[PDB]
């Protein structure tokens, strides 16, 4: 049987990368967080107070409570029967902003712009994204030079 | 053994209650006997009230 320690098996997770030890950069301290903000959790070995558990490392959740120097965030954790949305308090250094929602917000703004436009014109524009279509059949020009013949290389013992 | 939220109860059936079970199959006969005795007493005390003092 294994021990139930809180930091068991976090030899590499709660460890700073190579040549990035020392003083924590202050941008993380001086970047703000609002309620309902999508945030991914990544533990930091330098700061021990408010360190999230190893199970929440890499998990992403939304912010519901903001204290003086910590963030209350609800994350979905799956425990052997079901997924539970549970709230944890994580300090600032162990929290990052998620750009996945920003990518969708930018597309929403583009859709709003393209719906405000092309409406008085009357031309309906395709708003929905599409998967990779066929490669739009085309011509290949072999200008003068013929294709290069490829002969398989005979075997030879090198080592 | 308890099973999924049952009421915790303690029946008092640890003695030899089956030997001291008191049936009531004589209830109507007892009522008839009491009625007959009451009527007999009323006929005994002819002018006196049936209920009594």
């Amino acid at each position: 049987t294994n021990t139930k320690g809180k930091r068991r098996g976090t030899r590499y997770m709660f460890s700073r990368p190579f040549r990035k030890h020392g003083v924590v950069p202050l941008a993380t301290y001086m970047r703000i967080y609002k309620k309902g903000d999508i945030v991914d959790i990544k533990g930091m070995g330098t700061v021990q107070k408010g360190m999230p558990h190893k199970c929440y490392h890499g998990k992403t959740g939304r912010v519901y409570n903001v204290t003086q120097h910590a963030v209350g965030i609800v994350v979905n954790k799956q425990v052997k029967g079901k997924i539970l949305a549970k709230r944890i308090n994580v300090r600032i250094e162990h929290i990052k902003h998620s750009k996945s929602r920003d990518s969708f917000l930018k597309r929403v703004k583009e859709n709003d712009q393209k719906k405000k436009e092309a409406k008085e014109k009357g031309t309906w524009v395709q708003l929905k994204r599409q998967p990779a279509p066929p490669r739009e059949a085309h011509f290949v020009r072999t200008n003068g030079k013929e294709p290069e013949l490829l002969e398989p290389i005979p075997y030879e013992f090198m080592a | 053994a308890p099973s999924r939220n049952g009421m915790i109860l303690k029946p008092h059936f640890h003695k030899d209650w089956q030997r001291r079970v008191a049936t009531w199959f004589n209830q109507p006969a007892r009522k008839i006997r009491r009625r007959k005795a009451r009527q007999a007493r009323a006929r005994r005390i002819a002018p006196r009230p049936a209920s009594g003092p």
Binding site: - | N5, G6, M7, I8, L9
Partner: protein, 187 residues
């Protein structure tokens, strides 16, 4: 050789009432015909509620019916209740109504008839408005029974307010280890 899970292929919804009384079955036949002919969904809802069991159609109180009819818009509309209408003793002013119900208590019936209201049965409601036009469909509180107070998260669990099954409430039957902070713990 097809992978189809037959776990929930059979729907458990009722098709006919389990009661063997004949008047309810006649009403069931009437509303079956009305639902399968008319395009109104009121007949279908009434038939489904007639199919429901006793606990699934709780009685509706006179005060609740009054407050539901007092809402702006449903003026001069007939109230349709598949359960039973019961008198409420804590209400004095009872306006006249048009109530359709399977049963009405004697006190509530007297109150409604004295107020100048009208009480109709389901066959009379079908004769009057076959498609249920000008009707307000009402029902009693489903969770009104004390049975549902014992349902939900079990007691002895944090943030649970479920009534436990106790032989008799008292000082020395509960509120001990598991509920007192001074004795073990509490939830």
């Amino acid at each position: 050789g097809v992978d189809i899970r037959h776990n929930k292929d059979r729907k458990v919804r009722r098709k006919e009432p389990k009661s063997q009384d004949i008047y309810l079955r006649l009403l069931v036949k009437l509303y079956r015909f009305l639902a399968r002919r008319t395009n109104s969904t009121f007949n279908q809802v009434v038939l489904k509620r007639l199919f429901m069991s006793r606990t699934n159609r709780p009685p509706l109180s006179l005060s609740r019916m009054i407050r539901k009819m007092k809402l702006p818009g449903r003026e001069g509309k007939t109230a349709v209740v598949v359960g039973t209408i019961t008198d409420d003793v804590r209400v004095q002013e009872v306006p006249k109504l048009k109530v359709c119900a399977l049963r009405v208590s004697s006190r509530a019936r007297s109150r409604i008839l004295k107020a100048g209201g009208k009480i109709l049965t389901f066959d009379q409601l079908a004769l009057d408005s076959p498609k249920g036009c000008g009707t307000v469909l009402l029902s009693g509180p489903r969770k009104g029974r004390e049975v549902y107070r014992h349902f939900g998260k079990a007691p002895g669990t944090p943030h649970s307010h479920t009534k436990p099954y106790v032989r008799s409430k008292g000082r020395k039957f509960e509120r001990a280890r598991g509920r007192r902070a001074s004795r073990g713990y509490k939830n």
